[PDB]
Each structure stands twice: as structure tokens, then as C-alpha cells.
């Protein structure tokens, strides 16, 4: 059972498949947050060429919730979900940012290339199935000293085409 969604940004759109079959809690949380428009106006605030771009931080929203929460009632962090068939290989892997074991809230990254040292440290919960060339343009974005793009792509909306929960 998979979820399907489009992230529409000020600098391109991404078509995404969610692995609700292998990472149900992370997909559910994400879709519950999509439901209440949580990601609208958030940016992609960290971008490293040949690695990944990172988004989903409530605290950096350029505007409802001011701090980062999960999609579940209460907003508490949720546990990691790993699967051997899901590895940080190649462009367009959708995965969870964290600060150690079981600290998943709302921040995520999309890979520009393999980074398999992250396997079994980060919940991979999807992949970009369309818009790989938007991603390739993001990879070229000029960034400051802290790796924030000078012009961060900002989420206009997320269109959910299928939520299996």
C-alpha cells in the first residue's frame, strides 16, 4: 500500500511515492500533517551539493504550529522504521531527519546521491517518482556558510492524490 503526493514549491514540483507498506508510521504522520497544511510556507533550509536537500522545519516557516511536531495527536516523536529493501541509494530518496534514535517529527530530506552511511539511522519513507530535474536544479543552488540556499525553495502546497490510511 503506497501513498502518492505532489509537493508544489516556488521553484518546481516533486511527485512522490510514500512507502506506507514499509514505513507506515512515518507516512501516516506526514499525511496527517499534509491534511492540516502544516508544510505550507516551510522552506528547504539546508542544501548540500552531492548529498541532499533538507526541509520540513516548522520553526523556519515563512508564513499553524510554530514548533516541529509529528502528525499524531499530541505531536510526540515516533520510532524509527528501517527495512533492508530501503537504502539511501541514488537520487530522490525521501528520508527522515532526526537527532538520534526515535526522534522523528516533521523534518525530512531528499537525496541528490547515495549516502548509505545513513542506512538504519534514518527512516526512509518515500521516493521522488517525478521531478528529478527540479531536484538537479536545487542541487545547484547557491548557499550561505550554514548551507542555507540564498533563495530557498518554499512549499506552496502539497497535493495528496492517495492516502492509504
Amino acid at each position: 500500500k503506497k501513498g502518492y503526493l505532489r509537493i508544489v514549491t516556488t521553484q518546481g514540483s516533486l511527485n512522490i511515492e510514500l512507502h506506507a507498506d514499509m514505513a507506515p508510521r512515518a507516512c501516516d504522520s506526514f499525511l496527517r500533517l499534509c491534511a492540516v497544511k502544516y508544510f505550507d510556507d516551510t522552506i528547504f533550509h539546508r542544501c548540500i551539493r552531492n548529498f541532499m536537500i533538507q526541509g520540513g522545519r516548522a520553526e523556519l516557516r515563512q508564513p499553524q504550529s510554530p514548533r516541529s511536531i509529528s502528525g499524531f495527536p499530541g505531536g510526540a516523536p515516533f520510532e524509527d522504521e528501517f527495512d533492508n529493501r530501503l537504502v539511501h541509494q541514488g537520487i530522490g530518496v525521501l528520508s527522515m531527519a532526526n537527532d538520534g534514535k526515535h526522534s522523528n517529527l516533521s523534518e525530512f530530506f531528499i537525496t541528490f546521491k547515495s549516502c548509505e552511511h545513513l542506512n538504519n539511522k534514518h527512516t526512509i519513507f518515500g521516493r521522488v517518482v517525478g521531478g528529478l530535474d527540479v531536484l538537479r536544479q536545487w542541487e545547484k543552488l547557491e548557499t550561505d556558510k550554514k548551507d542555507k540556499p540564498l533563495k530557498p525553495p518554499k512549499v506552496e502546497e502539497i497535493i495528496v492524490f492517495k492516502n492509504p490510511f
Binding site: 548529498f51 533538507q54 531527519a97 532526526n98 537527532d99 526522534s103 550554514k146
Partner: peptide, 11 residues
């Protein structure tokens, strides 16, 4: 190094 953290970016 090459991490994806939320607050303390490490090497």
C-alpha cells in the same frame, strides 16, 4: 561529515 540532523549539525 555528511549528516541529516535537526539542531546540532555535526561533521
Amino acid at each position: 561529515x555528511l549528516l541529516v540532523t535537526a539542531g546540532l549539525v555535526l561533521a
